[PDB]
Structure formats: C-alpha cells, structure tokens
C-alpha cells in the first residue's frame, strides 16, 4: 500500500479519494491518506467548504512516483506535487503514520467497486487526454472543456477526448449515407476501434474515465463523452459479443455507484431510453436495464 501525504489543511474542504469522501476542518491536523491499494489508478478530489465552485482533483498512480498534496495560498487550491527524494519522502510519511495523522483508505475486502469502475483506465491514456507533460499526475476540474466543446477556449486546459460526431464525414461513408447513419457499425468498428483506439480496452478506458470525471467533478463535457460512447455502441448492429457483455458490466457498476440525488443531471433521458428500449442492443444490456429500471424508473 502507498500513501498521499498532505503538508497541511489550511482551508476547510471535503476531500474525495476514489469513491470515498470525508470532511476536513479549517487547520485541522490532517496529513493525508494511507493504505491506498496498489494496482489501480486513483483520483483525489476537493470541494472547498467556503466555495463549492470548482470541484477539482488529480488522477495518479502510486507506482509512478511519490506524490503529496500542499495548499497554495496564492492560487487558492490543494496542489499535487511529486517528491523525487525518496528517503526524504518515506521519512515524512513514517512520522505522519507514527502520529496517526492520516486517514486510511477504507477498502472493504469483499468490495471490487473501484476495480470495476477503473478496469480499463490506465494512467498513460489519461495523460494523453489531459495534456501537461511535466507531471506524472493529471489535474481535472468542473469547468474544463473538451476539444469537441471548443470546436462548437484555452487548449492547454482542455480534455482531449476522442471526438465522436454522428453527422460528420468521419462517421458517414460517401455512398453509404443511410446505412451508416442508421447502423453505426462502420464508425464503431472501422473508424474508432480499428482506426483510433486500436482495441476495445482503450475504448472502454476512455468511457470509464469520462464517466468518473462527470461524477466526481460535475464535468459537463465528460458526461457528453460518456453518453456518446455508449450510444455509438448501442446504435451499432455489429458489435463483438464480448464487447456487449463487458459493456453491460461496466454500465451496471457506473449506475450502481452514481449518487441517487445526482441522477437528474448525470443521466441523459434520450440516450438511455434509446439504448435500453429502441437500439440494436436493447436486449443486450440485461444487468444495466435491470438496475436502471429498479433504481431510476422515473428517467424511463
């Protein structure tokens, strides 16, 4: 297990770590989070008590370096930093661990929730969507726009998700207009899977990353991207069978984890009714259909 220490907590803040969250009071003696399960990406996220504007956070992998959080009073946020002095770093954490100034990542042993939400998410792929090459971790916030959103405005601060547009020349072969618009299999399998993503694992990783950015930061363009990537699969008559089975599992855990009180805003009625009841794959998402019907029957 690895550790994200904090220099301090000078401002009152709700801290997120993956799907967990806890409150820290202004100048409470907090020095971070320990026992973080190795083998997964993680996300540490922040919502200030005195200004819920700008949820923000960092995607990181403890295998890639020693990272800590320090408040910057000038820019007004908790910043992630990398410490290269490894023995310095261990020395600091051990003192914080000895004084019990760190919360423990509260992972139940039965519980695979985080694995199931991040199965295909890799740090190297995150760092290509979020471009800041000097850091091994990636900053995302509530307000960052996506490349596609910026085509319809500081490119350095943008989410470079793969653009999906059903009425674009990329999606529609000259001479196959009706075919390709009503059956997106060409766009899914040739343009996206074989051409851009190379395999379904990269596709699902971007889909899972988009969902998590929507859920944890309220990032609107991330929510658009997650729905577009679901719709493109569901709107395809020809999808490898293992892809459909895995999608059902991926979506089931996303719907299971979504806060019930955020459903009115995180779920697009049109996309979901189309995918579950009218689409080519309307019968291929049994687990997702069952949780959506039992948990959010109003949306449908």
């Amino acid at each position: 297990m690895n550790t994200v220490p904090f220099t301090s907590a000078p401002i009152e803040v709700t801290i997120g770590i993956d799907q967990y969250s806890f409150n820290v009071k202004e100048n409470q003696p907090f020095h971070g989070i320990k026992d973080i399960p190795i083998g997964h990406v993680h996300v540490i996220h922040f919502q200030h008590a005195d200004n819920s504007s700008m949820r923000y956070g960092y995607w990181f992998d403890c295998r890639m370096g020693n990272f800590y959080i320090q408040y910057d009073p000038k820019d007004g946020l908790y910043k992630m930093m990398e410490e290269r002095d490894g023995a310095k770093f261990e020395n600091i954490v051990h003192n914080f661990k000895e004084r019990q100034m760190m919360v423990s990542y509260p992972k139940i042993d039965e519980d695979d929730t985080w694995y199931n939400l991040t199965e295909f998410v890799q740090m190297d792929k995150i760092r290509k969507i979020v471009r800041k090459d000097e850091n091994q971790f990636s900053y995302v916030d509530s307000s960052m726009t996506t490349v596609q959103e910026n085509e319809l405005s500081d490119p350095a601060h943008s989410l470079n998700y793969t653009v999906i547009n059903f009425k674009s020349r990329e999606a529609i072969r000259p001479g196959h207009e009706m075919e390709d618009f009503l059956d997106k299999s060409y766009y899914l399998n040739t343009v996206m899977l074989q051409g851009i993503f190379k395999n379904s694992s990269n596709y699902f990783g971007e889909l899972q990353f988009a969902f998590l950015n929507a859920m944890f930061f309220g990032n609107y363009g991330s929510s658009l991207q997650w729905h577009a990537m679901i719709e493109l699969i569901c709107s395809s008559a020809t999808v490898p069978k293992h892809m459909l089975d895995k999608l059902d599992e991926i979506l089931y855990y996303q719907i299971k984890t979504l806060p019930e009180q955020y459903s009115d805003i995180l779920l697009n009625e049109r996309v979901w009714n189309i995918c579950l009841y009218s689409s080519f794959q309307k019968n291929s998402l049994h687990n997702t259909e069952k949780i959506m019907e039992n948990k959010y029957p109003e949306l449908l």
Partner: protein
C-alpha cells in the same frame, strides 16, 4: 433554423433557395388479397423541388422500380429524396447552388443533412409554414408525366408559367399556394373553377390557364370562397 411567417419575405430575396417536399415520393394503393389480407402496390412518385423566387420546379420522377426488393419503404423514401436532392445540387454549377434548402417535413432534416455533409455552407432548414405542395399531383400535366414514366426521369417546369412578367415572386408564390391549397381541399371544385370557361386555354408549355390580370382576381376570389366553403362544410359553420 425554421422558416415561418416572421421571415416570409426571406423566400423572395436574392439568396438561392429551394423548397423540398417528399410527400409524393412513395405512393401506394392499398387493396385486399385473394386470401383476405391487405396488400400495397406502389405507383410512380415524384420529388417536388421548387426555387420560390424563380418558379423553377425540378420534378424528379420516382419510378416504382426503385422500391423493388427494398424494405421499410417509408424510411427509404426520405433517404432516396435526400440522395436525389444532393445529386441535383452537385449537377448544378457553383453559382446556381442553393444557399438554403427548406424541407416541408422535419423527418427530411437528418437524411438531407447527412447527404449534404460535403456542402457545409448550405443551410438545411424546416419551416413552420403549412405548404400545400402535396397537391402538385392535382396539376394535370405533372400528374400525367409522373404516371407515364417507365424509368427514372427529371422533368423541368416553371410552376409560375410567365406570371413573373406581370407580378412579383411574393405575389406569384401567394397565388400558387392558394391554388394548391384549393386543389388540396376540394380538387374537383378547384379544377371546375380553373377550367369552367373554355375560351381561356392553357398554352402548350404552361400548367395553368392564360388568365388576364382581372380574370386572375376573379379566380383567386373563387378559390378563397371554395376554401371558406369547405371550411364551413367541415366544421359545420
């Protein structure tokens, strides 16, 4: 966006535009089979593509062979319409290409948009006007060319005859829409009004009779009376 009554004068400005109506593309007769089921038989159709400023009607005749062996014909019909309009715009030189194409039914929007991806500068728009272009087939010469077709064919007409020599496009469109509404509301009565009098004839290349200006006023009043008369018959007014 949509075209309506506030921006009605825009139809007659100098931006080339085309109305497209697909309501007579896929046409069928419904009949009983020997086993007592119901069966359809397609008959020839047409796309009604009209530039409102000039009166130019690009009548693409849809021959029944295009439906042979095809499924979901009502859906295919929209995409076939969009294919043909796209082919028409490609056939014209850049200076005769529309800036806007207005579809009379919103179901034509996605088909036409997808077929016209190569033409990002041509706006594809619905309209809130209820245009009676379905009654094109009540015009005898147009009906005749469509039903006689033995193969796909593009037949060209001025839907205003030579009215633009004496009236504005705005007025010519108003006249056309009143005539077509009347033909749509009571076809037999409308044709009676138009052809009651034998000494007013239809010139060899024209669709409508050669009414003088004063006779057109009389005809227009009779057409209005017909619409009002049918509206009263309908609603018991």
């Amino acid at each position: 966006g949509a075209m309506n009554s506030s921006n009605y004068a825009e139809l007659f400005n100098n931006d080339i535009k085309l109305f497209v109506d697909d309501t007579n593309v896929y046409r069928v007769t419904v009949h009983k089979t020997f086993e007592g089921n119901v069966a359809t038989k397609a008959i020839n159709g047409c796309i009604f593509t009209l530039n409102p400023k000039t009166g130019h009607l690009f009548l693409k005749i849809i021959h029944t062979s295009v439906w042979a062996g095809q499924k979901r014909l009502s859906q295919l019909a929209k995409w076939k319409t969009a294919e043909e309009v796209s082919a028409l715009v490609r056939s014209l030189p850049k200076e005769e290409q529309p800036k806007q194409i207005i579809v009379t039914r919103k179901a034509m929007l996605d088909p036409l948009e997808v077929h016209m991806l190569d033409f990002p500068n041509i706006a594809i728009r619905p309209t809130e006007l209820r245009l009676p272009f379905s009654a094109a087939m009540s015009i005898d010469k147009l009906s005749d060319v469509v039903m006689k077709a033995t193969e796909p064919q593009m037949v060209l007409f001025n839907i205003y005859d030579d009215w633009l020599d004496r009236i504005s496009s705005y007025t010519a469109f108003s006249r056309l829409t009143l005539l077509l509404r009347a033909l749509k509301t009571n076809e037999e009565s409308a044709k009676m009004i138009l052809l009651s009098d034998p000494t007013i004839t239809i010139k060899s290349y024209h669709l409508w009779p050669s009414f003088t200006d004063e006779q057109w006023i009389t005809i227009e009043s009779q057409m209005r009376d017909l619409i009002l008369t049918e509206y009263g018959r309908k609603y018991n007014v």
